[PDB]
Amino acid sequence: ASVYAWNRKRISNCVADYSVLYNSASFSTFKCYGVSPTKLNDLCFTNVYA
Amino acid sequence: SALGKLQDVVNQNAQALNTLVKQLSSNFGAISSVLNDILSRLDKVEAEV
């Protein structure tokens, strides 16, 4: 999406392996602000919004 | 109401202990006051801060 009309996808009813994201050669930054990316696989969330 | 001295000494200690327990729920600027939230969410170098 554009910046002004930025797009939200709600994510629900799944298992997600965040290591598959974090280890991806694609990403130039992966900064996190209250969870460390190594710890994501130990957690479960009431909602996730991308 | 005659025993106000002794019942106040009991109340002061109960209020002191309940204040000390309720202060476990205070953040003091941490991301959570529950110590297991920090240790489950954050890796060592961030968690220590």
From Swiss-Prot, chain B:
Parts forming coiled coils: 7-49
Function: Subunit of the fusion protein that is processed upon entry into the host cell. Mediates fusion of the virion and cellular membranes by functioning as a class I viral fusion protein. Contains a viral fusion peptide that is unmasked after S2 cleavage. This cleavage can occur at the cell membrane by host TMPRSS2 or during endocytosis by host CSTL. In either case, this triggers an extensive and irreversible conformational change that leads to fusion of the viral envelope with the cellular cytoplasmic membrane, releasing viral genomic RNA into the host cell cytoplasm.
Residues of the full protein shown: 943 to 991 of 1273
Record gene name: S
Domain of life: Viruses
Protein name: Spike protein S2'
